[PDB]
Amino acid sequence: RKPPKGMFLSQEDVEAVSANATAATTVLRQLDMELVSVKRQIQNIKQTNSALKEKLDGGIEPYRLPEVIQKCNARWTTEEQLLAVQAIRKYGRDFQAISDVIGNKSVVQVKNFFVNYRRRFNIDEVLQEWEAE
Amino acid sequence: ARTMQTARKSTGGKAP
């Protein structure tokens, strides 16, 4: 019913070695040049990737700034209220981004902030021009 | 034929 394990004897393949005499040494060269054709293209992206690696030397260690460690307060200084209306104009609704700029306010306080002062700061007017970019 | 092999008798296609 089935070949010995490891034998590969498909009906399709059998007609293919036997259509004619050298139809054997045909489809076995068809692989030796389809096996080098890839095998060069490895080294030929393997070397392009060795170039990109050289350009990324040392990483981004020159360009890091220390973490802004600061406990997270509850009252809204007129500074924090003003850092806020500007993040909303640069960050849309990404509260998460917004509560890093202010950095001692919480993503929740962020959400409440949008609610409480929406009439006063015309946050609506704000957000609609954020959308225009 | 196949019966004749006395050394290293082959297996494939037998009824074992």
Place this chain on the structure above:
Amino acid sequence: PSGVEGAAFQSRLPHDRMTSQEAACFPDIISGPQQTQKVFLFIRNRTLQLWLDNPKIQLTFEATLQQLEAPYNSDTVLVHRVHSYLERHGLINFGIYKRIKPLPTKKTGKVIIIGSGVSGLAAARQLQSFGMDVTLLEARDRVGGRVATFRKGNYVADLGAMVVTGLGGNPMAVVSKQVNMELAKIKQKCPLYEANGQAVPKEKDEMVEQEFNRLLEATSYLSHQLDFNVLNNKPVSLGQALEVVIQLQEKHVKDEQIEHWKKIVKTQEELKELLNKMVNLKEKIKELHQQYKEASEVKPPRDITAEFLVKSKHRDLTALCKEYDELAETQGKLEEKLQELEANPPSDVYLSSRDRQILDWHFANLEFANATPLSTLSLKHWDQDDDFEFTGSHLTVRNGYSCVPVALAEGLDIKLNTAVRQVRYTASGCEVIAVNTRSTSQTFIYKCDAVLCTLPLGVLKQQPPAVQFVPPLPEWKTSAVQRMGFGNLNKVVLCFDRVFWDPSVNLFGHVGSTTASRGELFLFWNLYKAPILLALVAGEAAGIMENISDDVIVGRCLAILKGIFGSSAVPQPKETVVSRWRADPWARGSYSYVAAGSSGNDYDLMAQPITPGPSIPGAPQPIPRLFFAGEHTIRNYPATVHGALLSGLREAGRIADQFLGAMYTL
């Protein structure tokens, strides 16, 4: 099996069922009542058991029925009907047995037997035992046909049959009990040795051989599963199947590498994509870092728009430093996954020229068993006789196999040096025209009732014909002779003055340098009591080596030995012998095979005797006058000696029934 059911197997017969031959002799019983059939099968097996129990002397019908046990020993007519069917088709009282009921005073019928061959000798004794006049025409000056025994001094070697393939259910076992025969087992252990003379290693020996058999089963699958037996309209040879199996494995090795390095380039290109984002991200990090430093230059206190611009660029720069690390986690996995795929590559190639050399030795081993190259062997039917293989060790005759035919031919009428030229079979009889091989003017005319023809298939296949059949053998017969195969196998014998080989090893190999030399002296044998080596030439090699001198052969032969045992160790041999069977006019080959396009069913056509045409027109269809026996005529056991022997018992039955009456079918 032991007991009565043992005897049925030792006689090549199912203990629990009637054979197709028992049916034509006993059709009132086979089609009768299920208990009936049982009673008969017991009578058969019980008799066989008696003969096989001590076959040195004749089994009278009296002795049988004496020992028969009630209720079986009641129906005496059935016992006669059974003791006759056995003795008649020679399942009992065949061989060299001291006769109880002495031979009849006056024989009836004349039978010329063409060839003092093993099949022919087998017939001669049965017909002579039956009460007929038997006379044998042999072309050689020695009795055995392809059982040749070279004898010189104490050196002894068979250039013909050499091994008994198993005593399980073998007729030859009975002969040994009757004949004096030194049967010694062959130990199957066979080392191998490549061209260098260095022994092969258990690693590769086993790696090769199992892949060989696996390749066999592959062809067997192609043959019976994919009905692969035609291609550009010809039949498929076993060799052709093998190379398409091998060529599909060399195909799969390449498909397997290609979808592996094609995995590497999929991950090289996931990395090439990855670095490109990293380099572009770094530039964005490099510039945001600038902008942050530039707006940090504005010193406190500052208004909130610029205080936002430092907070902002700081959050933006922490946002892209966080991306660039999750892209160096990801270069972590891919830089790893790509040493994975390089440290676990697949099989480098299907077979090393060191492998395919040791593989070509397993194909020489086939071409030895079939005495032909595998281009010729038929894909579906080459092994069709596998089911009747006997059981036990293979054995050898240390005192020379020829001791059997010489024992078999005692007391028969044999005319040596008598070359049959022409067989004339006519409605009233047969006349056989024979020259004397020494002085081929000298003519002999022999007249007889029926002619039993153990001519080897080669001699029949010969064109121009060694023997002319008057009238022509009909087209169904001649075409059965073209389709079949007679192949070739040769032996070199090397007779030294002392052992320089492993004496407890009976045989060892030699791997050949290319494919085309795979059978060239591929296997040696140490079987004879004296220090004798003996070496095979199978495959295409054996036919081609007939044209080379003994010296050249023995020279080559001697070399391979030196590479295995060392130049100092191997002395020049005292006497040496080289067979050339395709060259012998009383063989024209070695034994037979199922040629591509042939079947086991052409072997049956070779048995079917010939009944000549009416002499006077409008006369009644006559008797069948021309009979055939020999190793080439016996589908279930071809190419062997036991098989040839059986065939000549077959025609002793068939002849006696045709000329002395079927007295057991009432």
